[PDB]
Amino acid sequence: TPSYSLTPAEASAVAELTLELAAAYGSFGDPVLLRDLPRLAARLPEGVQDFLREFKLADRHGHTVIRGHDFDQRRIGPTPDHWRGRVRPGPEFPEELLLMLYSALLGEPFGWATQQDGHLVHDIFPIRSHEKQLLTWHTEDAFHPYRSDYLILGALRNPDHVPTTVGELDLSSLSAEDIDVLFEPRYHIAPDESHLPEAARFATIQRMIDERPLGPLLYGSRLDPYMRLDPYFTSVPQDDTDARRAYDALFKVVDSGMREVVADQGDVLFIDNHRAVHGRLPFQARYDGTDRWLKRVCVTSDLRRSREMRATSATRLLG
């Protein structure tokens, strides 16, 4: 797995640009910052731009990491209690912007209007409210036609080095018969809850919500397939014995290939949502303000493709 380790000079240039941008724009609520993202991202170290572009275009690895960023722990401040009601942007604005720049290099930043007040940058930290653990892994929103193309996870802090799980597909482990079955629309993938704590928009998912169209698991190249796998919310018709058999073999290959990848402080992990599944590992959280803290941006290659489910032309938020 290709990775990029920034020099102190690169790390300094990235930190500097990050602070200069945070001082010139109010928030992501600012329309012009969103406009300017790609032009602004062209001000990053050329080596960093080149690296990410090669990852995107190679379309070969499920994940990559840019390491050795300088995240000012004093400035960033203590890991907060909750995301809700919290004033945005916080002191860690610089780092959020960084992930936004990285997102514009990859595609476009987007979010879910219900998820975390619909903030384009998502918080990942322990919460006592939403607190024997089952080690699960998945494609992000595997059911959804407009699911992420890429995920960017920036580790602000990770004092106990709690890894992330990420796994890819090994084809040589599967027969040509199983693969062919997996390409066919013979599988149900259920949605997700995310409800409670606008009709023409809503009645769109209703094609999956009422009729429930069977979709494939593998698509793209047949020699190097993409995947959408969420074993927890996946269903197969009982009478489709071929499909169930091919689903078992696919699970067994992916499950056994899972790797632990640590996003330590200063790391930014890039997950290709079409080539890799990811997951959480359980950990003992302190709640004192020193807890592991990641930020997360969802990237779409094609914003306009989701227009039917977006409120207006301008909004990057779905639903």
Ligand X SMILES: N=C(N)NCCCC[C@H](N)C(=O)O
Residues that bind Fe ion in the complex, under the rule CB under 5 A: 140
Residues at the site binding ligand X, with contacts judged by CB under 6 A: 21, 24-25, 30, 32
Q: How far is the CB of 96 from a second copy (least distance, A)?
A: 20
Cα(255)–Cα(237) distance, integer angstroms: 22
- Whether the bond into 89 is cis, omega within 30 of 0: yes
Which residue, among 304, 298, 294, has the nearest Cα to 69 in the 3D structure?
A: 294
Cα(249)–Cα(155) distance, integer angstroms: 34
Q: How far is the CB of 89 from ligand X (least distance, A)?
A: 13
Residue (265 or 300) nearer to a second copy, CB? 300
The interface partner of residue 303, options being ligand X, a second copy, Fe ion, none and the CB cut-off 5 to 8 Å by kind, is a second copy
Find out whether 62 and 150 touch, Cβ atoms under 8 Å: no
Q: How far is the CB of 99 from ligand X (least distance, A)?
A: 17
Find out whether 135 and 281 touch, Cβ atoms under 8 Å: yes
Q: Which residue type occupies 189?
A: I
Q: Is 141 annotated as a binding residue?
A: yes
Which residue, among 179, 173, 158, 135, has the nearest Cα to 277 in the 3D structure?
A: 135
Find out whether 142 and 228 touch, Cβ atoms under 8 Å: yes
Q: Is 278 annotated as a binding residue?
A: yes
Residue (29 or 282) nearer to ligand X, CB? 29
Residue (83 or 226) nearer to a second copy, CB? 226
Q: Is 228 annotated as a binding residue?
A: no
| φ/ψ bin of 25: left (φ > 0), alpha (ψ from -120 to 50), beta (otherwise) | beta
Residues at the site binding a second copy, with contacts judged by CB under 8 A: 34-36, 38-39, 42, 46, 49-50, 53-54, 57-60, 105, 149, 200, 219-224, 226, 274, 301-305, 307-308, 310, 313-314
Q: Is 69 annotated as a binding residue?
A: no
Q: Would you mind telling me the total number of residues written for the chain in this entry?
A: 319
Q: How far is the CB of 275 from a second copy (least distance, A)?
A: 10
* Binding-site residue set for Fe(3+): 138, 140-141, 195, 278
* Binding-site residue set for 2-oxoglutarate: 164, 280, 292, 296
